[PDB]
UniProtKB/TrEMBL annotation:
Origin organism lineage: Viruses, Duplodnaviria, Heunggongvirae, Peploviricota, Herviviricetes
Position of the signal peptide: none
Species annotation: Human herpesvirus 8 type M
Protein name per Swiss-Prot or TrEMBL: ORF K6
Domain of life: Viruses
Keyword Iron: no
Shown residues in whole-protein numbering: 29 to 95 of 95
Length: 69
């Protein structure tokens, strides 16, 4: 849908989550002003994280990249 809303992070989580709760990750929309990733937890919590941060890239590497929709 050319008129669908876009999911974006306005604010990122600055402190690393516990790896044990993380399931997978996926990027937010390319339409967003600041590029983001979601770290999705086993309980389904969507954690906004900044892929310009090395610690976020390292978690990303350890997790499967799995499209949400």
């Amino acid at each position: 849908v050319s008129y669908t809303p876009n999911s974006c992070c306005y604010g990122f989580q600055q402190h690393p989550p516990p790896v044990q709760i993380l399931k997978e990750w996926y990027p937010t929309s390319p339409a967003c002003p600041k590029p983001g990733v979601i770290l999705l937890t086993k309980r389904g919590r969507q954690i906004c994280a900044d892929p310009s941060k090395n610690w976020v890239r390292q978690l990303m590497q350890r997790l499967p990249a799995i499209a949400h929709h």
